[PDB]
């Protein structure tokens, strides 16, 4: 596309460091645009992302780097009967009525455990010391990975993150950094070494862990789903389900620190925490551009005539800064009117864990503000955000008296 010649000079590193300037141009110039370094069309506005995610002429497709990492059948990349089975498999523990039965006794003692390690120090780095551990310990226990240390769960989602966002392609459309997939392969090998013995045991002795239920639920007597059939969805969980609640917590905190009067409001009135989190997810979406859809017939989107079989990356983190929807979207504002947002996606492949994720984040922040009401940002240490596919702060240094 001639007027988008400048996109030829956009780099993967630029998008990872801060994608918002490029995507501000894309939203104005070309809401659906082919980005050469990504080797794909990209949807940048709320209207186009929603249309693609919900269209009857599109279905799920995994990104190239996602496919190289997760294989088949990753719940995010399949459709039809297989997708319906995988959704039936994961949905029971995520049902709102079910989550409300046990989410408090799950998350609150975990939040207290990690808080007790530092709440009297007067300083902490909240990403590593609190947000990520609460996120991975809660979900890890739900899955049946109680014996997998939070440090290890966090290392796995970091490696899987970098692997499935290893999207850069060269002039010929081949991956520019094929060696970047090796650490994804290494994480999967380690995951297998840990989880294979657990699956062995769950096949013979089912329990209330989620992975045990993935093996057994809905199956004929004495049968389980083959481990190869569920492993890619295990990997999906060990990346985003482990990573995103902690990132959403942390981005919410960074935004509140950027509006000190709003931080004070929420500490004083913790019933405002759900609204603070919803704005945090819009303001810096944890899953920023990690999923995609593929057209199943010729379709015209945003004035582009796409052939059948065209992938489109859904850059939801950009759509959540759509100035057709939001005033001054790069500013965190607790008091923004509650509007629809796309941080959980849309359509048949929208996030299955929204209700759970929202409560994990709410409980973590409630406990944090109860334990340390006088939290302040360490204004010497600046907050760097990183990531194009998944985005969040790399650290969050705070102090308190
Ligand atoms: C704040 C935290 C989270 C955010 C922002 C988030 C966001 C998203 C997004 C954007 C997608 C892709 C939707 C699309 O392509 O349209 C997704 C998919 C998914 N998420 Fe969440 N997620 C979060 C936490 C979780 C958790 C904790 C779980 C599990 C307990 C989970 C389970 C899933 C599943 C299973 C899918 C695949 C859905 C499908 O393809 O059918 N998510 N999520
Ligand atoms: C819930 O985990 C994911 C969601 C979207 C893309 C990759 C993931 O691991």
Author numbering: 6 to 406
Paste lines from the article.
The closest contact is with GcoA-F169, which forms a hydrophobic interaction with the C6 carbon on the aromatic ring of guaiacol. A broader survey of variants at the GcoA-F169 position (amino acids S, H, V, I, and L in addition to A) confirmed that GcoA-F169A exhibits the best catalytic performance in terms of both specific activity and reaction coupling, although other small side chains (S and V) also permitted reactivity with syringol, suggesting that these may permit syringol to assume a reactive conformation at the heme. Each protein variant also crystallized successfully with guaiacol and the structures showed that the orientation of the bound ligand remained consistent with that of the WT enzyme. Furthermore, comparison of the surrounding active site architecture confirmed no significant deviation from the WT.
GcoA belongs to the CYP255A family of cytochrome P450 enzymes. Our recent characterization of a two-component P450 enzyme system consisting of a reductase, GcoB, and a P450 oxidase, GcoA, demonstrated that it demethylates diverse aromatic compounds, including guaiacol (which can be derived from coniferyl alcohol and represents the aromatic functionality of G-lignin that must undergo demethylation), guaethol, anisole (methoxybenzene), 2-methylanisole, and 3-methoxycatechol (3MC) with similar or greater efficiency than other O-aryl-demethylases described in the literature. However, GcoAB shows poor reactivity toward syringol, which can be derived from sinapyl alcohol via high-temperature reactions and represents the aromatic functionality of S-lignin that must undergo O-demethylation for further catabolism via ring-opening dioxygenases. In the present study, we hypothesized that substitution of GcoA-F169, which has the closest interaction with the bound substrate, may relax the specificity of the enzyme sufficiently to permit the O-demethylation of S-lignin type substrates.
